[PDB]
Swiss-Prot record, chains A, B:
Name of this protein: Galectin-10
Description of how the protein assembles with itself and partners: Interacts with CEL.
GO molecular function term, any single one: carbohydrate binding
Cell compartments where the protein resides: Cytoplasm, Cytosol; Cytoplasmic granule
Any one annotated GO CC term: cytosol
Species of the source: Homo sapiens (Human)
Chief subcellular location: cytoplasm
Length: 141, 141
């Protein structure tokens, strides 16, 4: 929609940071659109990924990290709070021990830190969505 | 790029028809962009799919049909003629017994007809590509 997709923003994260995303799938869930959010260690798209979050709408969510070019241990969830045909609000909070993903206000996934969040330099949001809002908060020391 | 993605065009197919697509992946192959081409039986995106062609660039290709709302027997290929970071030219020829997919001029996949190609009313091209050319030929009786 308003923001370009794939969407890339330079970013820094630490405990207390929140990444907020508002968007809509580009296809009905029968057609299995995807959503992906990657927290990268550099601006380059081939850089390592501290937190990879990939939704296959209506089916499953996979989370992982990519470290020195290699994918690590995948975490697979069948939790599916996203609603067919609807706009979603996604919040990703940086807690001391993990990322916490809220979907439409509901805690829905968490992922323990494998790499310190301070390693993040870029966030990419892409695949089969339109994006109307993206924000990273910067209020904490 | 120039054409909107997801790209939808009303279409009719019969023996001798060719669907030609020129585009570029939106991500490096390390990030596993997808490409999908679906031949639908109606203009509605939830309609049945006579031919579903889904590339995970650098990894695999899956082909299938969706008949009365249900996916049928998946065909999986590890053939990967697509080149990292490059524009591709995809041709899909309607032969009497099958679809034949050419990638950059090279025969790369085929899929036997499960539903007559005359059932097609729409083609959708979507997922992680930009599109510069789309054509369906209409030269044959």
């Amino acid at each position: 929609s308003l923001l370009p997709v794939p969407y890339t923003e330079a970013a820094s994260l630490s405990t207390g940071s929140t990444v907020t995303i508002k968007g809509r799938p580009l296809a009905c869930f029968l057609n299995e659109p995807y959503l992906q959010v990657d927290f990268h260690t550099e601006m380059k798209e081939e850089s390592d990924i501290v937190f990879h979050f990939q939704v296959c709408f209506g089916r499953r969510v996979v989370m992982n990290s990519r470290e020195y070019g290699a994918w690590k241990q995948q975490v697979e969830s069948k939790n599916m709070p996203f609603q067919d045909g609807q706009e979603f609000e996604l919040s990703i909070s940086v807690l001391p021990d993990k990322y916490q993903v809220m979907v439409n206000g509901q805690s829905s996934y968490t992922f323990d830190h494998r790499i310190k969040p301070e390693a993040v330099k870029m966030v990419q949001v892409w695949r089969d969505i339109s994006l109307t809002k993206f924000n990273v908060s910067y209020l904490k020391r």
